[PDB]
From a paper:
[name] has a hollow, spherical homo-24-mer structure and reactions take place at active sites inside the chamber. Here, we report the biochemical and structural characterizations of SORs from the thermoacidophilic archaeon [name] (StSOR) and present high-resolution structures determined by X-ray crystallography and cryogenic electron microscopy (cryo-EM). Each monomer has an 8-stranded β barrel core surrounded by 10 α helices.
The crystal contains 8 monomers per asymmetric unit and the 24-mer with a pseudo-432 point group was generated by applying the crystallographic 3-fold rotation axis. The final model contains residues from Pro2 to Leu311 of all chains without a disordered region. The iron atom in the active site is ligated to His86, His90, Glu114 (bidentate) and two waters designated as Wat1 and Wat2. Electron density maps around the Sγ atoms of the cysteine residues clearly indicate that all are mainly present as free thiols in the StSOR crystal. The hydrophobic side chains of the chimneys were clearly observed in the electron density map of the crystal structure.
Numbering used by the authors:
A (entry chain G), B (entry chain B), C (entry chain E), D (entry chain A): 2 to 311
Amino acid sequence: PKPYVAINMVEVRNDPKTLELFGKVGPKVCMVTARHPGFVGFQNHVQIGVVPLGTRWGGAKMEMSQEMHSLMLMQYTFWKNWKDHEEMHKQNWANLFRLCLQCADQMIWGPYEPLYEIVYANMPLNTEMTDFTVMVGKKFAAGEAVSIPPISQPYGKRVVAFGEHIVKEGLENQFEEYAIKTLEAFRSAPGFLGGMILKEIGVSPLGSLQLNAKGFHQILETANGMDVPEPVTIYEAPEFRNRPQRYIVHTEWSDTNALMFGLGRVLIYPEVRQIHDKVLDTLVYGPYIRVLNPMMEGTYWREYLNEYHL
Amino acid sequence: PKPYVAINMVEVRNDPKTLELFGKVGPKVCMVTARHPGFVGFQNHVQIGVVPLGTRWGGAKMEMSQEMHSLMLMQYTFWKNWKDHEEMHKQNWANLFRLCLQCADQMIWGPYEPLYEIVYANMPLNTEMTDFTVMVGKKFAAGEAVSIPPISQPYGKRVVAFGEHIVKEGLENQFEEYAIKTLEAFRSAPGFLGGMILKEIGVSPLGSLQLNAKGFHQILETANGMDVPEPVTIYEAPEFRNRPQRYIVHTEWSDTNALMFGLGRVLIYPEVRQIHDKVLDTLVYGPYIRVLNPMMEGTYWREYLNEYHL
Amino acid sequence: PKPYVAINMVEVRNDPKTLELFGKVGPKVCMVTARHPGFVGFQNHVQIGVVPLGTRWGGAKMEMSQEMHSLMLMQYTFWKNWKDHEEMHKQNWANLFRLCLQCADQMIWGPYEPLYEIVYANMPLNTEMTDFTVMVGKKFAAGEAVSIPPISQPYGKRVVAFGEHIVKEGLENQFEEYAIKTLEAFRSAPGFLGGMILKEIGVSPLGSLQLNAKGFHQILETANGMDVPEPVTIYEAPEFRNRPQRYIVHTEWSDTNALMFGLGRVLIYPEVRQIHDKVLDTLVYGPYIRVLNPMMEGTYWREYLNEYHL
Amino acid sequence: PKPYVAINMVEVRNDPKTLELFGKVGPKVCMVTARHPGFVGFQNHVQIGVVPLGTRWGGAKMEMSQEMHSLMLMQYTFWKNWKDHEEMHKQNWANLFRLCLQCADQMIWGPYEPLYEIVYANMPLNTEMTDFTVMVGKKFAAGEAVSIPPISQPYGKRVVAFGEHIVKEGLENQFEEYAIKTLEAFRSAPGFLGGMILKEIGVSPLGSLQLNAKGFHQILETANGMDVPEPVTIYEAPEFRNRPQRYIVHTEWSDTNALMFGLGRVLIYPEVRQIHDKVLDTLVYGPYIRVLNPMMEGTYWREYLNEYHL
Ligand SMILES: [Fe+3]
Ligand SMILES: [Fe+3]
Ligand SMILES: [Fe+3]
Ligand SMILES: [Fe+3]
C-alpha cells in the first residue's frame, strides 16, 4: 500500500569533512529509525542542480554540484502511518538528537521536515543491471510480460526531478487530476523510471528541532547532545500544515538528458503540453524543479508500496 | 506613516559578471518603480551569512560571502498602500519584465516576492558620519535631545539581521506583543540601529513571474523579453497568503559583533531572555537569522515613515 | 557675499612627472593670484569619473582615474568681482604665463577659462573631523543649533558632482527656479555637503592663452616663457559669452555612493523627480555629470561667501 | 549597584583550532550561566601583553600576542551576590563541566576562578561610535551634560590594564584609599575609559575543577564529560581566601599608547606620582600590569552597575 513520507531537509557544507561525517552518521540514524515497526525504508538525496527551462533560471545547470559551497539534502523516510514517524522521533529522541548534533558543525539551514501523503505513485522496485534477468523471468512466469518495469538502478545510478508546486485554494482536485495525467504521459519518455505526487499534510516538530522556549535553550546550550532537551513542543505536525497546498512532483530518470527532454514533453510535445497546461493554471508558485541524486536508500520501501519483491 | 513592503527574493550566481550586471540593471528597475506615486523608496540586501547561535548552524558564519557560489538577494520596496506595488507591476509590466530577464543568465531561484504590513517600526533616518552635526543641531534646536537617533550609515556601512519566524494559528497577538518588547529591549544594546516587524499579507504574482499557462510559456519562449508575455495571473496577492503566519523580524546593527552580542541578549541577559521566551513559545518555525548587507538603498523611505527629513 | 568664479580647464598627462610638476607649480600660481586683493580663494579639482545613470554612459564609472592616460583639471578661483580676475591676469601676466608654460610638456588641451556668476549657493565652511566640536559649540552659543552644517572635509576628503547643462533661450528663469528647488531637496540626502549653481558670463582671453596673431606666435616661439608675449587680445571676456546659456550645477558629497544615491533622488524619489523634470524640460544639452576630487583648496573662499569663520 | 565578579583564568594553546573551538563553546557557557537570575553579564579577555615600565620587564611588550604559543584568558562574570555564582555552578554542573571539557585538548593551566568584591567602580556604559549621538542626547535631556562618559567601544575595540597587587596585612585601608585617588586622577588622562578595584574574597571550587579525591578521579577518567563527576568539594569559596590580600586594579583605555602614558602618570606626573607612592608603600607584590583585549562581552553588566541604559 501507499506509505506516508517525511522529507528531512537540511543545507550542509560541501566539504570532505561533511561527506565523511554524513557517511558515518547517516547509517546510524537509519538504524535508530528502523527500531519502529512502522518504518518501511528511506531514500536520501543530494541536490546536484536545477532544471533551467531554457534561460528562466539561466544561472543554473542540472549538474552544478562541483561549483557549490553547500549542499541541500532531502532525506525521505517512508511510514505505514504518518503518526509512526512522530512516535519514532518521540521514542528515540535522545539517540536521534545526539546523532543530529554530530552534523552540527556542518549545518547551514534546517532541519525542516514536512510530512506528506502520496496522491499517486508509479514507482517500480529498484533493480541493479545484474538483476534484470530475475525480474524478466519472474514477470514472464506470472503472465505479466505487459507490466515488466524499467531498470531503475539504486545507490546513485539514476536521477530525480523534485518539482515544487503550490496550488491555489480550491484548485487541488484539478492539479491532482492533470499532474497524474502528466506523469502517465511520462511513461512514453525514454529513461522514465516512475514518479509520485506528494501532498504536504504537516511538519514534524521534533524532526525540525522545534521545541518550546525551554527546549530551544537546551538545544543551544547542549555539549554535543550529552545534555538532552526535554522534547516538549508547542504544536503537533497537523498544526503546521502550510496553505496554500504544497505538492512535490517527484519523477525519476535514467540520467539528466532523459530528465530534461522527458520533462520537456510538457513544453515541446503539443499533446502533453495541453495536459500540463491544466496543471500550470492551478499554480500560485512553480513549477521549480531541483535535480537530485538518490545516493543512500532502503529500496524495500518500494516492496511495501508494490506489495512484492524479487 | 508606516509603508507596506514588498521583498523581491532571488538567488543569483556569485560572479563578477553578476555584480556588474546587477549594478547596471538594479538602478533602472528603481527608476521604473519610481514612475508610480505610491513608491516611497527601497532597501536592497545581499545575504552575507547566518547567525549560528553557538553550534546550532555550526557550518555557518555571519560573514560567509567569499566562500559562496551563489548569493541570496532581498530587495525591499516600500509603498504607501500594498496595492500600489501591484498596480506599478501591471502598469510597467513590459519594461520591468525586460529588465528582470537581463538578470536571466545569472538566476538560480526566484523571483519570489511576498508582501508585508509593518506591525512595528523603530527605524531612524539614515545618516552619513558627515551628517551627525546637522542631525544633533536640528534635534537640540527642537528640544528633542532625548530622541536623537544613532548614526545608521547608508550604502553598505551597517548590517541587517533578517529573522524568519512562523507562528502557530491563534498565537499571532502573543508573538507581536513580545517581539515588540524584545525590539524595545534592543535599544539598550551597543550598535543597535533600529528594527521593524513585517507580517506577510500576500505574494505578488507579477513580481514572482507567476502567470497562467499561456503567460508561463511566453516567459520561457521570449528572446530576452522582446516578446512580452500577456500579464494574466490565476491569482491576486491576497490569494497567496501563507498560513501559518510568516513574520520577518528585521533589525539593524553597526557591525556583525554588535548584531551577535545584541541579538544574543535574548540568550545571555536573563531579563531579555524572559521576554523573548514568550516569542519562542509561539513558533512553529524559527528563529532562523540571516545576516544581510544593505547595499543600494533609497533612504527617503524612512523620511516617509518618520514624517521628517534633515 | 557671493563671489564670481573662474574655472581654469586643462587636460594633462596622467604621469608621476605631471603629479610632481603640478604639486610644485600649482602653489606658485595660487601665490601669484593672491597678489590681487579681489582674490578670495580657490578650489582645484581632478576629474575621477562620470556618473553613468544606469547604462546611459555604460563605459564610464564614478572612479575611472587609475584607468586613464590623461586627467581633466577644473581649477576654480573666487573673486569679489569678475573683473578682478581679468585685472590679476593682466597685472601678473609675465609670472603667470611662465608658470603656465612649466606645465607645457604635460598639456593635451587647454587652458580654457570660463567665468561665472553664482545664481545660488548653499556651500558651508569646510571643517576637518577635529573641528566639529568648535563648530557645534560656536553655533549652539549663537542660538543657531538649527543651522549647524554637515562636516565637509577639505583637501581630497569628499567628492564633487560637476553637472553640465545648456538651457534653451527663454527658459533660463525656469531652469534656475527648479535647479534651486532640486538642490534644496538634496539637503535631505545622506552625505550632501552643499551645492551651487554657476551661470557662465564670459571666457577669460588671458586665462585661455587667446591673444592676437602676434601674441599667438610669441606663445609658440617662447623658450619656456622667458620670451613674454605682449598680452594684447582681440576680445574681452563678455565678448565670448556662449549661447545658449551654460550652467554648472556643482554639488558636494561625502563619497561617491552618497553622490550616486543622492543625485539619484531626481530619478528614484517621485516628489524630487517631479521638481527636476522642470529642469530637464529646459535643456538643449545635458545633464552630463563629471565626478571630481577637490584636492588643493583655499577654503577661506567659503568664509567670504558665508561672512563668518570658525 | 556593584555586582560581585568571578574571574575564570585559563591558559590555552594559541592555535586556529583553539580560536574556533572557544568561539563555539564560549557562547554556550554564557547561555548556561544566564539560566541563573543573579547573572548580570560578562567580560571575556585575552592577554595580549605586559606593561614593561621602561626595562623592568624588558622582554615584554604591550602587544606580544602574535609571538606567543599560549594565551592567558581572564573571563569575568558579574553577579548580584557572589553566592549566585556558586549556586549557578552547582545547579548547572553537568552542562558546564561538559562544555569546560570541550576546551580540554587546548588547556595548559587552569581553570582557576577567584571571586571578588568591587571596592570602587567608575565604569561607564559601553557605546559603539554609532551610539554617541544617543548617549549625548539622553545625558543632556536628563540634565547630566556634566557627567557624559567617554566612548568606551565594546567587542575588542579598546584595551584593559590588569594590575596585580598584593597588600601587606593591615595596609588594606591605605591601599584602597590611594588606589581610588589614583583612578580618580586617571579621569584627566586622554583615552581613559574607566576603572574598578577588585578585592579577592575567595576561590570557586567548582569553577576551579577542585573536588574531593573521588571527584578528581572522575574528572581524569571521564570520556569528554559524558561521565559526570559528583560535585563534592572539600571547601567552600571563602575557605580559599588568599592572604595577604590580593587586588586587581582594572583600568580601560582607548588604545595601548593611551594606557602607557595614562598609567604612566603615576611615574611622570609629579602630583599623581605623590598619590600612587602611597599605594606602592602598601605592596608585598606588584604592581604587575597585564595588557588585556576585552573581546566577547555582555555589556549589560554596566547597566546593572550604573542602574540605567540607553
Ligand atoms: Fe524524521
Ligand atoms: Fe515588485
Ligand atoms: Fe585665471
Ligand atoms: Fe564560574
